[PDB]
Amino acid sequence: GRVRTKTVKRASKVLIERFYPKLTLDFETNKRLTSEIAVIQSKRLRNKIAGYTTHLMKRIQKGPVRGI
Amino acid sequence: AILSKKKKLVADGVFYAELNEFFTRELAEQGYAGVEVRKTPSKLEVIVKASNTQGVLGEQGRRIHELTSLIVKRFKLSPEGIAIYAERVEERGLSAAVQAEALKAKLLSGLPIRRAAYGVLRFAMGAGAKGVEVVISGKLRAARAKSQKYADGFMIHSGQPTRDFIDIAIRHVLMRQGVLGIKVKIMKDPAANRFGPRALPDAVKIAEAKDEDEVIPAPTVKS
Amino acid sequence: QQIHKIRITLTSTKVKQLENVSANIIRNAAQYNIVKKGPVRMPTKVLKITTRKTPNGEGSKTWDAYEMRIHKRVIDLQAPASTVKRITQITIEPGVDVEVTI
Amino acid sequence: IPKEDRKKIHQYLFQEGVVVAKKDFNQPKHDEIDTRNLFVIKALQSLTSKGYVKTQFSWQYYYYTLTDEGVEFLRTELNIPEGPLTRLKNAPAE
Amino acid sequence: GQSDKRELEGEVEGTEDAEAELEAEAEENDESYLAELELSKQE
RNA sequence: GGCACCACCAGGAGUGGAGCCUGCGGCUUAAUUUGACUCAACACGGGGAAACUCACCAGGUCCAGACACAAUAAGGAUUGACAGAUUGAGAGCUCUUUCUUGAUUUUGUGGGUGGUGGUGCAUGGCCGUUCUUAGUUGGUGGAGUGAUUUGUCUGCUUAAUUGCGAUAACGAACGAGACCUUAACCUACUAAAUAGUGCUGCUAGCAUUUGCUGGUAUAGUCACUUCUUAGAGGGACUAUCGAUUUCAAGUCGAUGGAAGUUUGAGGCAAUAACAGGUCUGUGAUGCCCUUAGACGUUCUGGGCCGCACGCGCGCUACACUGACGGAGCCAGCGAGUAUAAGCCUUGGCCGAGAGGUCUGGGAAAUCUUGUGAAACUCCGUCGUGCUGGGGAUAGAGCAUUGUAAUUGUUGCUCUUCAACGAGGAAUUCCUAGUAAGCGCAAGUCAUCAGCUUGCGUUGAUUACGUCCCUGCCCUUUGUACACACCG
C-alpha cells in the first residue's frame, strides 16, 4: 500500500499553516520550495512531504481541510 | 613481504583488532576507551584514549616506555618506527567503555548494584548523553541468575542511526561466584556530532513565518 | 632523472578521505602547471565473508554477511620526482596508503 | 635449564626489560634469546611466580614486563655493576 | 536491590556519587648509565 | 473479529515409492567420542573425521608439578646417553653397561598448573524462538480508596497501533515508518594506456568501385566517454486524468515513465521472556572431579564409515518435449604467491584419457579469464525394446594428492549393467525474471562437494482472493492458576 505515515502527514500540514501563500498546486515547484523552508535529512522524505503537501493543496481548493 | 591489496588492508585491520584487545587487558584499570592508529611516513603514531593518563604515563613515563617496547618486540618493528601517545578522553561521561570499566571497578569493590548502576546513569546524562540504558546480568549470592535494565531519557533502537550516534561496551566481571555481564549503551546527542549527521533522520525543523509585513501601494525607491 | 611519467596508487576503505586526497592532489597539480591524468576509479572490490550466526549449532540456520569495500585509484603525473613526493606529504591521510611507481 | 642458557634469558629481560614470546613450546629459537622458546616461557614463569615480572597474555602471545623490584634482583644475582632501557627515563611526550 | 530501601539509598547515594564526580572531573579538566655499555667495558 | 503460500483456494515443481549420498535412532563394537528430539533436533555444531583434527578404543613416552619450606646433596642433588637385551619402534621406556653434565635440579609438605572431564538446571557473552507478528510506554486531564483504567477505540483503510475518523481525552516516545546496503535510468557533469570505440600510421585475406572482414598500435607523444568503471548530483512523490469511498484515509484502472507490487531485494529492528542451545569457540567463567600408572600433553595403530532394521535433508532416474555423435556457442558473483614450505595458472610439447613436462604472466579492471559453463540450438544415428533410458554392484588395469589410500580419497580405461516402466496413506516449497530446470565461483580444502553461501543462463502455469483447515494476534468471557495447565 501507499499509506503515508505520521512523520510526513503532520510535517506537511505544518507547512501549509505556515507557508500557504508561497505554496502551489505543482509538485515540482513545491519540492524546490520545501528544500529552503525545512531542513530535511534525506532526499526521499523531502519529495514525500511535498507530494502530500501538494495533495492537501489540491484538496484545499475544493473546500476546507481538517487539521489546517 | 609482498602482500596483496586484499590481504594488506585486512592485515591492518587484524593488527588493529589484536592491538586494541591488548590495551583492554593491560590498561583495564585506567578506563581504556579506544585506540587510533595514525600511520605516517617514518613513524607509526598510536593514540590511546583513557580516563587516566597517569597510570599509563607514570614514574617519569616508565610504563608507556616499557609498553611501547612490548609492541616493537612482538610485531618486529624498528625501535624508531613507532610512537605511542596517551591522550585524555575529553568527555568521560559520553564514553561507554569508560563507564563500563568504571562500573566493574565498583562492582568488584562490593558496592551495591543499585548504587553502582545509578552512578553511571547520572554520569552519562550529566555529560550530556541523549539517552543511556544499562543491563547487568549474572549471579549475586542467589543461585539463580538475573538481569536488570536501567533506562533513562531517549533511546533509539532500529536502523542505521544506532551505528552513528550509539556506542556500546560489554565486559565480563569476575566474581567469586561466577561472571557478571554488564552492557553500557550510551546515545550521544546528534547536535554535537562533528563528522556524521547532526540530527535524526525523521527530525523535521520547519522555519518560522517571515510574513506580516505592511505593503504600500506602488512607490519607487531610487538609488 | 628529471620530469617523469609517475604513478601514484591510492587504496583505502573509506571514500571521503580518498576523494579529498585525490582532489587535493589534483588541486595542487592545477595551480602548478603539471599535466595530469586522473583520477581513475578502479572497480571497487567487495571482500565478503559469510559465517553462521550460531556460536553453537542450534537454532534456525541464520547467516551473517560481512563486507569490506576496497576502493583503488591511480593518478598519472608528469613532473620531476622531487615534486611528486613532497605533494604526497602535503596530502597525507591516515586511512589512505600511497605507493609511487615509475 | 643450563646455567648458561638461563643467563642469556636474564640479559634479555634486562636491557630491554620486556620480553615477548609466542606460545609454541617446540619452537627452536624465540628469535631474540638464542635458546629454546620453551625455556623462555618457563624461566619467566618462575620470575612472575616470584613477583619480579608482570605477565600478560593476549592472542596466544606472552607480554612480559620487568618489575622495579626485579631490577634489584638482577642487580645482585647477576653480580653486575650497580649502574635497563625501558627505565632509562627517556620521558614521555606531550 | 529487592526492597523499598537500599534503592532509595541507591539513588540518593548513587546520584551524589556522580555529582561529586562530575564536579571533580570537571575540575580535573579545567585546571589541565645505560646497561649495554657495562657489558662492553671489559677491555 | 483479523493476518499469514513456514495456512488454505487455482495451480506449478515436487518429497514419501527405486538406487545411491549424507544425517538421526537402533543394533553391533575394543571404541564405533559427543550435543541437539515438533515447529525452533536429524547436509545442524560451519561436523565434506586416512594421520592431525580427537574428545573414543588398545598400547608407549614427557612434566612443560611454577613457588616457600623440609629432606638429600659436591666425597656429586640430578640430566642426557653409544653397544646388546627389551619394544610396534634408531622411545636410554626399561634392563646389563660405565660414561657425561653439574645445584638448573631428586623425595615429602603445602601450593599450583593443565584438562573436547561434569554441571548450559550454577553463570557471562553469543545465538535461536515467541516475532519480524505489530506490539510497548510515560506527561497532563477524566474514572476509581486502591491495585489499576482511559488515552491504546465502533467503523473504513494499510504490509503495519498506519492512517482517516469516532471520541474524556489532549498532546507525545520506542517499535513500524523513516534509516543503511544493493539492483534498474542519466548520449546531463568528472575523468580514465589496468575499459572501450572511431579515426589514423603499418598491415593482411575476398570482389576489385572508393567496398567487406581482420591483425597489429604502452609513442598515432591522436579524437571521444555511448558501451565499462565509480563520485558528486538529478530522477518517483502514486505524478496527471477517470472511477468508487463517510468524498476522508485509501483502493482499482488507464497515460507518461527506466522505474507506479513499500520501485525489486535485503541489513538493522521495541517492552519484557524460555531452565531453548552452546562451559566441544575462547588464556570467558563459579563449583565438583582429575592432576604423574593423568581425565594434562605427546607417539603408534584402530574408530568416529562399523549393519537383520525405522526416520529426515538430497542427488540420479524411470525417456522420443529423449539418449547418444558431431557441429553452433552465450554469463554473472568471485579467488589467486617469494627462500617459500609454496597460489591462480595461459602457452608449447608428450599422453586415448586421467595426467606428465618446459617456459612465461599475474600480489592482479593488466595474467589465469571473454573463466568460449551447462542446460540450449542445428544436423545425424537410435525407434517404444528394461532399448543406444538408468548406471548401482563388481573384476582387471592406468594416474594424482598425501609420511601413509588396506576399510577401494579422487580422477581415467575396458568389462559387468542391478532396482527403477512416474510411486499408497500422507506431506513440503512457491506469485515474476518468481517456481522450476541448468550450470559456475567461494567456504571447507594436501586430496575428496551428491553440502551450504552466492552468482548468472533458459524461463513459465495459476490467484492477486478467503478464513474452510493450520498457526498466531486482538476483543469479550470463566477461572479454585500467579513456580502461572509442565498449574
Ligand SMILES: [Mg+2]
Ligand atoms: Mg526509529
Ligand SMILES: [Mg+2]
Ligand atoms: Mg527499519
Ligand SMILES: [Mg+2]
Ligand atoms: Mg505445513
Ligand SMILES: [Mg+2]
Ligand atoms: Mg492447494
Ligand SMILES: [Mg+2]
Ligand atoms: Mg503430489
Ligand SMILES: [Mg+2]
Ligand atoms: Mg527429483
Ligand SMILES: [Mg+2]
Ligand atoms: Mg583420529
Ligand SMILES: [Mg+2]
Ligand atoms: Mg592418535
Ligand SMILES: [Mg+2]
Ligand atoms: Mg569412536
Ligand SMILES: [Mg+2]
Ligand atoms: Mg585431552
Ligand SMILES: [Mg+2]
Ligand atoms: Mg538455557
Ligand SMILES: [Mg+2]
Ligand atoms: Mg544463556
Ligand SMILES: [Mg+2]
Ligand atoms: Mg495518565
Ligand SMILES: [Mg+2]
Ligand atoms: Mg491520571
Ligand SMILES: [Mg+2]
Ligand atoms: Mg482519583
Ligand SMILES: [Mg+2]
Ligand atoms: Mg491500555
